[model samples]
Target: AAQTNAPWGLARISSTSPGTSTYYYDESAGQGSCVYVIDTGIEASHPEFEGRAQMVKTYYYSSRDGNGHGTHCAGTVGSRTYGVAKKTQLFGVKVLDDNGSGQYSTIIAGMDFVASDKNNRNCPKGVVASLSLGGGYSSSVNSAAARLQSSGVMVAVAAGNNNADARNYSPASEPSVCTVGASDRYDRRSSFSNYGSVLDIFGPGTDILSTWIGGSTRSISGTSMATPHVAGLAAYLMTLGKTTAASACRYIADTANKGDLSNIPFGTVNLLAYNNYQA
Candidate 1:
């Protein structure tokens, strides 16, 4: 259903179309899926995702949620009690500290851990990584993003919240990475969402209601929340018989409701049009 369409969407198809709730069901949904969330440690007790994510092999570099930002991102993507995708597994990693800040080196360290294993064994196939953080246009760990993709792991990153050109962000600007931009529930790009050719697709990221740390509920905003929306789509695509990130991405972009994009910037592909061409 279009209820989950990104902010840029003209309106909720669920609100406009009948039988939308039935369409939201993931008839092709993936089970036994694993996704690594590179953010602040997750709130393990959140009802939205109490037992959904596989935490046995999960790793956390930080002690706890410092600024409540990381946990918020986790709740959107994998929280059984708060997230949209309830069946996929999540691995939470903390590279940023209490002040909601971090370094490129620390991020790379976390990346290394995610691509490898807890028992020093190699990660099995079909694992995807979601990196909801962003840095400058170029950085040291930029190449590290490729490592995850090389191992057959799909990596998704945030385009940025600056509302500037997303091509100026680190991993988001990287060609190999699946850079995501944010849109509102109505599918309209947030006025603050920085976009560029780097953005592969858009997802829900404004006033998103999800699980909070203290067993409470709150509404937060950012491409962080948006990333999970696409991650869920990725997981859905994988279950629909897609094996590569590129194919999964093309699937969503190609099937999205192409309400309008006359106002969007250059190099942005229209999912609606793409769908027509494919059909």
Candidate 2:
């Protein structure tokens, strides 16, 4: 949606907990983990997507392309080797219509699925959730998210891409939520990225190359891409037994790529540094 070259919007936590990073590789490649992508339905069979997301459940609240926004969001969260956590399963909750927008109530309804096992045991029991879309910051919604977190689930969200003042949106603004802003290929803050003291972290969100719906490869850009980077990091962190939001987030913040703006109002995040940090 947003046109820049970053991989996806992501939150770089305040510190690095390498002890957790070692745990993911020590155990296995997300063999027992799962993630719920609360977005539009995904294409499911792209070549790069192989072994990426195992389809757990798919529900649609509306039927419209709305410009294929949901598909893009899904790609960011789980698009193969390049995806967040390639080995984890995905539960797709299509809350938005083809029109590219869904009612906030509808979005919350999808969260309901993540908060319970009636939809599937993958959630509540424990699963990472990549919430690439958002409207405003709501403490109540954050509380709900916290409940999920308390239950061992992690929720990653895109700091609004509107480039507006901080404190503008609900989920992103929510204190319990990880507010992810955008960064560029050079690892600099993207011009269009939103800035605020509340911006918890930043990730690659501009000009990210990915598989589009219908088997097409394109450079999609936005905070959406950033969301998954954190999601993947969380998955890896959980492997390290850093299951709590506070611990996982701390691991990401401390170990993430501290790009050029490391000392700025909100520090920058780098993908290579983050990837290498683990290696």
Q: How do all models score by TM-score?
A: 0.80, 0.77
Best by lDDT: 1
TM-score of candidate 2 versus the correct structure, residues matched by position: 0.77
Residue 176 CA displacement from its true place in model 1, Å: 1.0
The reply for model 1, stretches above 4 Å from the true place, is: 1-23, 27-29, 54-62, 118-125, 259-263, 271-279
Q: List candidate 2 stretches off by more than 4 Å.
A: 1-29, 51-67, 122-126, 137-140, 242-246, 262-278
lDDT of each: 0.61, 0.58
> Per-residue lDDT for 47-147 in model 2, tens only?
76675554444445333333455556656555553454545565566766655566777777777667684245543223677787877766666666666
- Across 214-249, the per-residue lDDT of candidate 1 in tens digits comes to 767678888877776666556545654555554566
